[PDB]
């Protein structure tokens, strides 16, 4: 046969891992990136997936598709679909009740179901793993949010099937995160687990009670439209204002300039998680004007103070809906890159009155890690 893989098919980014020789290896893509944008793009000559698709988004916005995870398993008339369509530069059309993304591709109008778009992302993840392993990869466990219904689950499975993957099982993202930390294998009775998942575009809080290998979902809360990208946007707005004051130019409607500034801001955010300052270095940001400056960790925290504090309300709501006190939480699990932000960890740890956080597994990789473990179990190789 071949190696079984765990795939986190994320809203904004995806990640693939493999369990072998007693260890999970998270697999780097051809750019050396351990996560891959959940982006597909269509041009005059080719279809682009992942990094290559995201890299040309400002030059080809209406034919660059993302957020298929917000469409998958839903109907066109869905209130969620109608709302979300407003914020996408690509077209969504109705095919006999079902949403389809419509693009131009090689001088032709083509349309794709959300699960076809996700199949393309899954194809890239498959090829990434095959490039690393030197072997054909067919079996996989693919993750979804706990709140996904059977239509969403089936459509996610269907995306894998279209990609040529044998989907062994669709498992919940918070379950995968808990499996990564071996929280179902502790010597004891019930364990109440809080998963704090602050992703690129979504914030999910999940409370699980694990006992006898059952991962009971007690509560879910969060914000479907809050993620690391919001914190990046506060930085983007900050520097747009700065460039206006410095140079009397509003760069807002130059898509390329704004995209480049955003990329710089994403990088600065990562750097600010392990350093107290970050350099912004952009050659010819606008009209040949260089933008070289810096931002301190304190200023980044100040720009996002409301959004950071605000993450605690879903935690309180999850607790209330699960009928549990703060002190009844056995384990706290960090998932999503934004959970590396020192201020967020401090906020969450203070909220739990000094309780230690499970954060040793790269939070951006924890879900694919648990998926890879489960994949090994299901294929019979753990």
CATH number of the domain bearing residue 161: 3.30.420.40
Binding-site residue set for ATP: 10-13, 69, 200-202, 266-273, 337-340
Burial class (CB in 10 A: 0-12, 13-18, 19+), 113: buried
**275: which 2 tokens?**
């350093």
- Give me the count of residues in the chain: 382
CATH number of residue 108's parent domain: 3.30.30.30
Other residues' Cβ atoms within 10 Å of the Cβ of residue 24: 20
Catalytic option among 69, 100, 157, 343: 69
| 104 among known catalytic residues | no
Q: Residues of 346-360 as b/e, b for ≥16 C-beta within 10 angstroms?
A: ebbeebeeebebbbe
Same domain, 177 and 73: no
Same domain, 27 and 136: yes
Contacts (Cβ under 8 Å, ≥6 apart) of 301: 308, 343
Binding-site residue set for ADP: 12-13, 200, 266, 269, 273, 337
Q: What's the total number of domains in the chain?
A: 4
Same domain, 246 and 290: yes
Same domain, 12 and 138: yes
Contacts (Cβ under 8 Å, ≥6 apart) of 234: 303, 304, 307
Same domain, 233 and 297: yes
Beta strands at 139-144 and 166-172: parallel, antiparallel or unpaired = parallel
Same domain, 170 and 194: no
Same domain, 200 and 326: yes
Which residues are 215's β-sheet partners?
210
Q: Residues of 151-178 as b/e, b for ≥16 C-beta within 10 angstroms?
A: ebbebbbbbbebbebebbebbbbbbbbb
Report in angstroms the alpha-carbon separations of 131 from 32, 162, 172: 12, 20, 27
Domain boundary at 120, 136, 156, which? 120
**342: which 2 tokens?**
């020192």
What is the H or E stretch that residue 329 is in?
none
| 150 among known catalytic residues | no
Report in angstroms the alpha-carbon separations of 258 from 33, 238, 320: 23, 12, 41
Catalytic option among 67, 84, 115, 173: 173
| 130 among known catalytic residues | no
Catalytic option among 184, 197, 204, 331: 197
Range of the domain at 344: 186-226+311-358
Rg (CA), the chain: 21
CATH number of residue 231's parent domain: 3.90.640.10
Spatial distance between the Cα atoms of 137 and 123, rounded to a whole number of angstroms = 10
Same domain, 251 and 125: no
Spatial distance between the Cα atoms of 27 and 124, rounded to a whole number of angstroms = 12
Same domain, 46 and 89: no
Binding-site residue set: 10-13, 69, 200-202, 266-273, 337-340
Same domain, 163 and 242: no
DSSP code, position 89:
S
Q: Determine the angle formed by the axes of helices 255-271 and 228-247, rounding to 10 degrees.
A: 120
| 197 among known catalytic residues | yes
Three-point CA angle 348, 352, 355, nearest 5°: 95
Same domain, 91 and 210: no
Same domain, 61 and 136: yes
């Amino acid at each position: 046969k071949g190696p079984a893989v765990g795939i986190d098919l994320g809203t904004t980014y995806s990640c693939v891992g493999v369990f072998q020789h007693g260890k999970v290896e998270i697999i780097a893509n051809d750019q050396g990136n351990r996560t891959t944008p959940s982006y597909v793009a269509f041009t005059d000559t080719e279809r682009l997936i992942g990094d290559a698709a995201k890299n040309q988004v400002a030059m080809n916005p209406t034919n660059t598709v993302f957020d298929a995870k917000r469409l998958i398993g839903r109907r066109f008339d869905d209130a969620v679909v109608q709302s979300d369509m407003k914020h996408w530069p690509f077209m969504v059309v109705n095919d006999a009740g079902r949403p389809k993304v419509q693009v131009e591709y090689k001088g032709e109008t083509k349309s794709f179901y959300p699960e076809e778009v996700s199949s393309m992302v899954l194809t890239k993840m498959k090829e990434i793993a095959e490039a690393y392993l030197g072997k054909t990869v067919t079996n996989a466990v693919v993750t979804v949010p706990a709140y996904f219904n059977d239509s969403q689950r089936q459509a996610t499975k269907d995306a894998g099937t279209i990609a040529g993957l044998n989907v062994l099982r669709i498992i919940n993202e918070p379950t995968a995160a808990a499996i990564a930390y071996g929280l179902d294998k502790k010597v004891g009775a019930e364990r109440n687990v809080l998963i704090f998942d602050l992703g690129g575009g979504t914030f999910d809080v999940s409370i699980l009670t694990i006992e006898d290998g059952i991962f009971e979902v007690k509560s879910t809360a969060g914000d479907t439209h809050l993620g690391g990208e919001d914190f990046d946007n506060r930085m983007v707005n900050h520097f747009i204002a700065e460039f206006k004051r410095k140079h009397k130019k509003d760069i807002s409607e130059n898509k390329r300039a704004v995209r480049r500034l955003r990329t710089a801001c994403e990088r600065a955010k990562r750097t600010l998680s392990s350093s107290t300052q970050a350099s912004i270095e952009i050659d010819s940001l606008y009209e040949g004007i260089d933008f070289y400056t810096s931002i301190t960790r304190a200023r980044f925290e100040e720009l996002n103070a409301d959004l950071f504090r605000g993450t605690l309300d879903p935690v309180e709501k999850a607790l209330r809906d699960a009928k549990l006190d703060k002190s009844q939480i056995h384990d706290i699990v960090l998932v999503g890159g934004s959970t590396r932000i020192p201020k967020i960890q401090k906020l969450l740890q203070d909220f739990f009155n000094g309780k230690e956080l499970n954060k040793s597994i790269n939070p951006d990789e924890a879900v694919a890690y648990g998926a890879a473990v489960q994949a090994a179990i299901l294929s019979g190789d753990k």
